[PDB]
């Protein structure tokens, strides 16, 4: 139980790379992405976003061993960054942070290309 399979390790590595990324000032870009607020706290959001996504949702799937491959988890991250960029303005901080984290996601996945 305590030992992760290779796929499980890779999933975890990608998830963690995005979660733990910090910029030069020590700011964890993941902060606002961990958990999306409520439909009642964000009326305009849920009416605009077809498939809402946050890192806690991704982390829960992973922990339930529900991702079958790396691409499946990447797709959810991509949904999240797409959602953030859709809702928010191109000059907004959330939008910029979503672009940075997107790069981290693809770099990490590619750096693990074999393993
Ligand atoms: O724009 C947000 O505040 C947001 C927060 C968490 C997940 C996706 C998002 O677009």
Swiss-Prot record:
There is a cross-link at residue 2 (Glycyl lysine isopeptide (Lys-Gly) (interchain with G-Cter in SUMO2)). Coiled coil: none annotated. Signal peptide: none annotated. Residues 2-112 form the Bromo domain. It is linked to Renal cell carcinoma: Renal cell carcinoma is a heterogeneous group of sporadic or hereditary carcinoma derived from cells of the proximal renal tubular epithelium. It is subclassified into clear cell renal carcinoma (non-papillary carcinoma), papillary renal cell carcinoma, chromophobe renal cell carcinoma, collecting duct carcinoma with medullary carcinoma of the kidney, and unclassified renal cell carcinoma. Clear cell renal cell carcinoma is the most common subtype. Component of the SWI/SNF-B (PBAF) chromatin remodeling complex, at least composed of SMARCA4/BRG1, SMARCB1/BAF47/SNF5, ACTL6A/BAF53A or ACTL6B/BAF53B, SMARCE1/BAF57, SMARCD1/BAF60A, SMARCD2/BAF60B, perhaps SMARCD3/BAF60C, SMARCC1/BAF155, SMARCC2/BAF170, PBRM1/BAF180, ARID2/BAF200 and actin. Interacts with PHF10/BAF45A. Interacts with acetylated 'Lys-14' of histone H3 (H3K14ac), and may also interact with other acetylated or methylated Lys residues on histone H3. Involved in transcriptional activation and repression of select genes by chromatin remodeling (alteration of DNA-nucleosome topology). Required for the stability of the SWI/SNF chromatin remodeling complex SWI/SNF-B (PBAF). Acts as a negative regulator of cell proliferation. This is Protein polybromo-1. The lineage of its organism: Eukaryota, Metazoa, Chordata, Craniata, Vertebrata. The chain holds residues 652 to 766 of 1689 of the full protein.
């Amino acid at each position: 139980s305590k030992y992760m399979t290779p796929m499980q390790q890779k999933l975890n590595e990608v998830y963690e790379a995005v979660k733990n990324y910090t910029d030069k000032r020590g700011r964890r870009l993941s902060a606002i992405f961990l958990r999306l607020p409520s439909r009642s706290e964000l009326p305009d959001y849920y009416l605009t976003i077809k498939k809402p996504m946050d890192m806690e949702k991704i982390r829960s799937h992973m922990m339930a061993n529900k991702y079958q491959d790396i691409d499946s988890m990447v797709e959810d991250f991509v949904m999240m960054f797409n959602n953030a960029c859709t809702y928010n303005e191109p000059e907004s901080l959330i939008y910029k942070d979503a672009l940075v984290l997107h790069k981290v996601l693809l770099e990490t996945r590619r750096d693990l290309e074999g393993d």
